[PDB]
Symmetry: C3
Subunit: 114 residues, 3 copies
């Protein structure tokens, strides 16, 4: 799985250990080994959410499987929770795009996962 | 909706008010309330289009519905127009990827839109 | 086609001519003219892969057609090869998301490719 967060929160507001926390929590949530989890945090961005430049985040979670209605609700609760606690972003100022990727459409290590 | 634009145009060349202009015009074009529109502008990027580093943009528009052949043509005319007028990017140096998202695949406010 | 790479490798480690090399090689691999190829390299990123922050990359390739199992295996070999040779990123720390885009879902030059 791959999780990306783009936010207007400044770099200094991102706590040390945040990438590790995301890795661990996503491994637990998705059930995938942490070795397969990649995380990418992009602070200091020029963004607006509903016209407002108050703290916000636009995120994506791509996974081969482990994506669906109930799972995505649970991921949203988890990830909005983390972004509220750690980055002080309101859950109602977060969007997360979920992508259920076909194994043949993910490249890794000179091949694909198919 | 989420609209993201990555560009090699420098930050100083992005005019004041541009995120609000995008928010407004996207609300009008998609028919969605402005409160649901998020926008993200990323200048100063290391990119090429057709092998050239002349001004260019790579963009995406994600929406739950309001995506289709005619609608996307309309959005492209709008958005290329804005990028030309405001950022001086030629329309034939812009790509926009459109994504029609299932509501169950968009997280917001600790849940999804489903 | 459009290829984006986000990496924690610093900007100074991206060699001169890299965007051109990607453009050329992708033109050949996809079979599309280089005039149609766009490339975007984002260095200095805050990322982890498998819990650690050795060089890594998260990438996407979007194309109208020219996407499928065998082709994506070939793209992965090409692209991992380039990132290993040029950016010294291990292939096992690269993920590439492939997207087969409908022509009506790609904007360009005030309209779509439909």
């Amino acid at each position: 799985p791959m999780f990306i967060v783009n936010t207007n929160v400044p770099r200094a507001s991102v706590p040390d250990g945040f990438l590790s926390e995301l890795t661990q929590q996503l491994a637990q949530a998705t059930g995938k080994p942490p070795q397969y989890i990649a995380v990418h945090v992009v602070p200091d961005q020029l963004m607006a959410f509903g016209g407002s430049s108050e703290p916000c985040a636009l995120c994506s979670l791509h996974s081969i499987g482990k994506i669906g209605g109930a799972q995505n609700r649970s991921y949203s609760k988890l990830l909005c929770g983390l972004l509220a606690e750690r980055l002080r972003i309101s859950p109602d100022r977060v969007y997360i795009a979920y992508y259920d990727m076909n194994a043949a459409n993910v490249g890794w290590n000179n091949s694909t996962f198919a």
